[PDB]
């Protein structure tokens, strides 16, 4: 019933993501020199290094705030490359499933703890 | 005053186009397996290999017929990729300028010759 426990849980989940091969395209900002039309499609770029930095700086007040930035990584991936036959679409689907499976217990534990406070 | 002169002029202009790096995406038909939404946007596909073949077979009666097929290559390019920041948009603009500058004297020489006949 610890309202601070999510911070270190999310730190370890991001460490696991950076170790997964499927995360490689999402570890740093999309390269706008390589893809100069990216900003015509995408409003707000996002990547796992930015999420990890935002957490480390204590600029997330809750794990749901962190989830909003992660959702944007997968929203942007689909918007720029929607082809279901592409390598990046299949990498996005597997890493999204991996994130959702591990974050679910972090969110429900946090919600339980918050009721008590 | 030669009404046949345009045939060899257009053959040499196509040779110059095929040697320009900007022509690479337009040298053969768009791959409809790689771009399966292409025919949802594009009514009549066209490429420089088809134009060269049509000329060689003597199926153009005038240089204006050849010119309108080449203009369709640039109409299709802009319709499928309109982003002004894309590499293909800037390649299209430069190659189109090059073609128009060389075809103008082929058309005016032919029109002069035709008046005489």
């Amino acid at each position: 019933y610890d309202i601070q426990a999510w911070k270190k849980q999310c730190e370890e989940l991001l460490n696991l993501i950076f170790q997964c091969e499927d995360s490689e395209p999402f570890r740093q900002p999309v390269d706008l020199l390589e893809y100069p039309d990216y900003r015509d499609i995408i409003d707000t770029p996002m990547d796992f290094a930015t999420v990890r930095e935002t957490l480390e700086a204590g600029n997330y007040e809750s794990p749901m705030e962190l989830c909003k930035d992660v959702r944007l990584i997968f929203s942007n991936s689909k918007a720029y490359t929607p082809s279901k036959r592409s390598r990046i679409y299949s990498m996005s689907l597997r890493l999204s499933a991996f994130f959702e499976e591990h974050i679910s217990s972090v969110l429900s534990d946090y919600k339980s703890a918050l009721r008590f406070h | 005053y030669d009404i046949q002169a345009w045939k060899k002029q257009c053959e040499e202009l196509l040779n110059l186009i095929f040697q320009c790096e900007d022509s690479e995406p337009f040298r053969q038909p768009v791959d409809l397996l790689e771009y399966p939404d292409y025919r949802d946007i594009i009514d009549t596909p066209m490429d420089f290999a088809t134009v060269r073949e049509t000329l060689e077979a003597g199926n153009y009666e005038s240089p204006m017929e050849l010119c309108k097929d080449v203009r369709l290559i640039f109409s299709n390019s802009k319709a499928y990729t309109p982003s002004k920041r894309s590499r293909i948009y800037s390649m299209s603009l430069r190659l189109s300028a090059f073609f128009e500058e060389h075809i103008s004297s082929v058309l005016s020489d032919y029109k002069s010759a035709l008046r005489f006949h």
Partner: peptide, 8 residues
């Protein structure tokens, strides 16, 4: 992708 844009 989005025309001759996107990643593959």
């Amino acid at each position: 992708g989005r025309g001759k844009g996107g990643k593959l």
